[PDB]
Amino acid sequence: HPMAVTIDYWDTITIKHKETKAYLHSHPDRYPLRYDDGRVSSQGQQVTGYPFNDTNNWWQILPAGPFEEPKLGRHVKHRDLVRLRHVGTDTYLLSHDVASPYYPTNQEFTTVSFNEAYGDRAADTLFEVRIEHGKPGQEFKSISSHFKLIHNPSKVAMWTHPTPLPDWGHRQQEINGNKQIAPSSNVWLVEDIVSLPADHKRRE
Ligand code: NA
């Protein structure tokens, strides 16, 4: 497929849910302190699934360890640990054992600052890219690498479903951590390497 290209660290990408077609998304709005059932959220930045194309779908895929200046040509591979930086808010994807908006059993997904992501909350910002049918050393590619995104501390899978969030979440889809990895509803794909120009050698 001409749009199936190996993804490199520091690329900016869009991440699309295979079954619902929603894009992984974020924006400045926060989770409410209390849900209707009385549970308490982290009040962190919302992470949602959004059906349309906009800049709030853009995430930069980054390495898992200490901060380093950008390098070119470092391919992401099956089962690598990664961070995902939301470009529009300059925050870092995080999950933790706080119950999600609609599923008391599933982990909340949110974002955190650079200082948190490379400091005391670093472990909670690491996610494994588990390619469906992946083999050791296999390169992660746009379009063709269907994958599950596994939170490294807890082994929950990033998940979504169709029933929209309330108005506080802009009636977008919930994103949370599924305790079961096997379901096909845990499958995502990278639709576009946004940062990689159309004339770049990597597309040849
Ligand atoms: Na582009």
Residue numbers in the entry: 334 to 537
Provide passages from the article that reported this PDB entry:
PMTs from three subfamilies form obligate dimers with different substrate specificities and require the concerted action of their transmembrane domains (TMDs) and a luminal MIR domain for catalysis.
Therefore, we purified the ctPmt4-MIR domain from Escherichia coli via a N-terminal hexa-histidine tag and solved the crystal structure at 1.2 Å resolution by molecular replacement. Therefore, in order to be able to compare PMT2 and PMT4 family MIR domains from the same species, we additionally purified the scPmt4-MIR domain and solved the crystal structure to 1.3 Å resolution. Characteristically, the Pmt4-MIR domain structures reveal a unique β-hairpin insertion (β-ins) of seven residues (RY(D/E)(D/N)GRΦ) in β2−β3 of MIRm1. β-ins is extensively stabilised by internal hydrogen-bonding and a central salt-bridge between the conserved 4th and 6th residue (ct: D370:R372, sc: D364:R366). It is fixed on top of the cap scaffold by hydrogen-bonding of the tyrosine (ct: Y368, sc: Y362) to a glutamate (ct: E441, sc: E434), and of the centrally-fixed arginine to the mainchain around a proline (ct: P434, sc: P427) within MIRm2. In particular, the α and β sites, which were demonstrated for scPmt2 to bind O-mannosylated peptides, are again occupied by ligands in ctPmt4-MIR and scPmt4-MIR respectively, in-line with the expectation that they are also sugar binding sites. Given that both the open γ site and β-ins of ctPmt4-MIR are also bound to acetate ligands, these too may be mannose binding sites, which would indeed provide an explanation for the importance of β-ins in O-mannosylation by Pmt4. Furthermore, the ctPmt4- and scPmt4-MIR domains have an asymmetric surface charge distribution with both a highly positively and negatively charged patch.
